[PDB]
Design a protein around this nucleic acid. Structure first.
Length: 55
DNA sequence: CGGGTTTTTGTTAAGGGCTGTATCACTGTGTAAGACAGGCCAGATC
C-alpha cells in the first residue's frame, strides 16, 4: 500500500521541494509512508488494485 | 489430495547513470529495361 502512496506523494514532494536526487526522495517518501498510519494509504491501495485488475 | 510453513520473485513510484541498437546525411556502385541502329526481308513502282 506504501508504493501507491509514494507514487501519489512524489508530485507533492516535487512541488514542496526542488528535488536533488530520486533515490533520497524515494527513501524519504517511503519513510513517510511507513511512519504514517495504514489508513492513509487505503485509497492509494484501492487505486493500485484497480489498475492491477484492469491491466 | 490438500493446506501450513518456508523459500524465492514482481510492482510501481524517478531522475540519474550506463549500455545497445536504429538512423541520418553523405556519397559510391552493381544491375536489368527498353531504346535504338542495323539486318533482313516482302510489297509497291518504273
Amino acid at each position: 500500500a506504501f508504493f501507491l502512496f509514494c507514487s501519489e506523494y512524489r508530485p507533492k514532494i516535487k512541488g514542496e521541494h526542488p528535488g536533488l536526487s530520486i533515490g533520497d526522495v524515494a527513501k524519504k517518501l517511503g519513510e513517510m509512508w511507513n511512519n504514517t498510519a495504514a489508513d492513509d494509504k487505503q485509497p492509494y491501495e484501492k487505486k493500485a488494485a484497480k489498475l492491477k485488475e484492469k491491466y
